[PDB]
Amino acid sequence: TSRRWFHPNITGVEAENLLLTRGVDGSFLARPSNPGDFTLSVRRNGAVTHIKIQNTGDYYDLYGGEKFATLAELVQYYMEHHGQLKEKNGDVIELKYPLNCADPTSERWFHGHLSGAEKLLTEKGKHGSFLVRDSQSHPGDFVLSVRTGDSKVTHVMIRCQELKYDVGGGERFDSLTDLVEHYKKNPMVETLGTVLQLKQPLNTTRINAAEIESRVRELSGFWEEFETLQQQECKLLYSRKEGQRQENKNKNRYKNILPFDHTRVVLHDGDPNPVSDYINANIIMPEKKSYIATQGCLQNTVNDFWRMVFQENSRVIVMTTKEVERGKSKCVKYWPDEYALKEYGVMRVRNVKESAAHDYTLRELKLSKVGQGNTERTVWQYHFRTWPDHGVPSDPGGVLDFLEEVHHKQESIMDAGPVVVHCSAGIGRTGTFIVIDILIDIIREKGVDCDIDVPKTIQMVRSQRSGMVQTEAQYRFIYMAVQHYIETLQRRIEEEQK
């Protein structure tokens, strides 16, 4: 869609002035920061109301509202459901008109201060590759550089006249984004007939895995790269109708954090005597090893969880949360005690042995269908217990050691199904763990000298489940986990050499 309602470089007073001069009653905007959190500024009856949105790494928690996977899903929900958002008193807050941001800093095509850019379009660029940079000679103006061929880099001047942008004729646009989007749909034609088609921006995130230390150093950067990735979320507003059904409302831990219809795990062989095909879970495919990203079990969904594990032929479970965190339920006990046997509907689970490490507990479980012999399989449960209540761990060593053991178990089991990964909502920690495993797996196969793209991988995983990887802290942790993994392999090679 757009995501123009989010202003990345704004203050509380600037937000109030914009809503009172450029907006009307029902106008709204989202803004960052109190660092780490977000604020929803809404105009109501000639006054500005600020609603706090907090995210510790699990979900976007709007004060006196609901929990959401993305800020785009939060906005889409209240724009479609008017009588849902209310104050502490009970007075309804209406989200009617989004206030568009003119700042192009969070755009993929915007490079700000590149110099007369041709080399970057020659080395990285392809046919239709384009970038927008600040003008060197005339301050305030901009330059559009576009590559065309099988052959040439064409420069188009963008003038800034009375807070409006133009290419020297035609229409005058309020922002750089409006100019870019118009000339993307209606392309520019050169004097000799060459079409200046704007198909894709220049990729500046892809790095060679061996050169991770240098990129992390330059990003220490991480905020600007993450916000650019966050701006892409408006393109991931896929259908979630199955989870929105009244039959499935109590099957979701959080009413709004729902699985996409195109990737959801569809359950079969259910009880005929309502809906028996639903579970808040999605099949994650890296575009070898597949994953099922799901929420923490609810007592009414424990039977559906085991139905999924059996149906999908899954042999490894990754639990990245404690049962209770900060006195709040995050996941119910879906496994029996050590040496005990428990029946969960049509499924039977046996806890063979519990092996405890400092960061995790390994539980050897035996899953089978009640009434059938030769249906039994070993399901290995890896329960990470040291992850902090808020934020991410300071050292990625424990997570990497855990994931390396998870990988080695999956690889050792012949004909094993997708790896079940879950936390509370199944998006924050779950998303972080899956992304780290995908990126590390590229290095496992291709070696230290291979191309890796952190935001591209996150965007691909986000198209399969709503808001995979929740915070900038998690985003930073993904980079630090890859860097630590590269460092360990580098030392192991040097140990053999020396």
We report the CATH number of the domain holding residue 321 as: 3.90.190.10
175 is in an annotated binding site: no
Q: What sign for the dihedral angle of Cα 127, 128, 129, 135?
A: positive
Do 220 and 188 share a structural domain? Answer: no
Kindly provide the b/e burial profile for residues 92-123, where b requires at least 16 CB atoms within 10 angstroms of the residue's own CB: ebbbebbbbbebbebebbbbeebeebeebbee
* CB contact at 8 A, 132 and 146: no
Give the whole-angstrom CA distance, residue 159 versus residue 138.
Answer: 9
Write a three-state SS string for the chain. CCCCCECCCCCHHHHHHHHHHCCCCCEEEEEECCCCCEEEEEEECCEEEEEEEECCCCCEEECCCCEECCHHHHHHHHHHCCCCCECCCCCECCCCEECCCCCCCCCCCEEECCCCCHHHHHHCCCCCEEEEEECCCCCCCEEEEEEECCCEEEEEEEEEECCEEECCCCCCECCHHHHHHHHHHCCEECCCCCEECCCEECCCCCEEHHHHHHHHHHHCCHHHHHHHHHHHHHHHCCCCCCCCCCCCHHHCCCCCCCCCCCCECCCCCCCCCCCCCCCCEEEECCCCCCEEEECCCCCCCHHHHHHHHHHCCCCEEEECCCCEECCEECCCCCCCCCCCEEEECCEEEEEEEEEECCCEEEEEEEEEECCCCCCCEEEEEEEECCCCCCCCCCCCHHHHHHHHHHHHHHHHCCCCCCEEEECCCCCCHHHHHHHHHHHHHHHHHHCCCCEECHHHHHHHHHCCCCCCCCCHHHHHHHHHHHHHHHHHHHHHHHHHHC
Resolution of this entry, Å: 2.5
Q: Which residue has the tokens 């689970």?
A: 349
470 is in an annotated binding site: yes
The tokens describing 291, both together, are 């994953």
Do 113 and 100 share a structural domain? Answer: no
426 is in an annotated binding site: yes
Nearest to 267 by CA among 304, 228, 318: 304
Do 358 and 229 share a structural domain? Answer: yes
* CB contact at 8 A, 451 and 209: yes
Do 222 and 188 share a structural domain? Answer: no
* CB contact at 8 A, 99 and 85: no
Q: Which residue has the tokens 């404690």?
A: 322
Do 130 and 81 share a structural domain? Answer: no
Helices 472-497, 454-462: crossing angle, 10 deg rounding: 130
Per the document, the length of the chain is 498
Burial of 421 (0-12, 13-18, 19+ CB in 10 A): buried
- What are the catalytic residues? 423
Note down the domain range covering 384.
202-498
Q: Which amino acid is at 13?
A: V
345 is in an annotated binding site: no
Do 155 and 13 share a structural domain? Answer: no
The tokens describing 107, both together, are 């755009």
290 is in an annotated binding site: no
Do 113 and 64 share a structural domain? Answer: no
Do 186 and 71 share a structural domain? Answer: no
Do 239 and 141 share a structural domain? Answer: no
CATH of residue 64's domain is 3.30.505.10
Number of domains in the chain: 3
Of 75, 106, 137, which marks where a domain is finished? 106
Give the whole-angstrom CA distance, residue 384 versus residue 432.
Answer: 13
Do 111 and 33 share a structural domain? Answer: no
Of 63, 82, 106, which marks where a domain is finished? 106
The HSE-up count of residue 293 (CA atoms within 13 Å, CB side) is: 31
Give the whole-angstrom CA distance, residue 163 versus residue 151.
Answer: 34
Q: Starting at the edge strand that comes first in sequence, how are the strands of the sheet with 67-68 ordered?
A: 67-68, 60-62, 47-54, 38-44, 27-32, 97-98
424 is in an annotated binding site: yes
Nearest to 28 by CA among 78, 63, 73, 64: 78
**Structure-determination technique:** X-ray
Do 139 and 51 share a structural domain? Answer: no
Of 201, 217, 242, which marks where a domain is finished? 201
Do 257 and 167 share a structural domain? Answer: no
Give the whole-angstrom CA distance, residue 178 versus residue 356.
Answer: 57
264 is in an annotated binding site: no
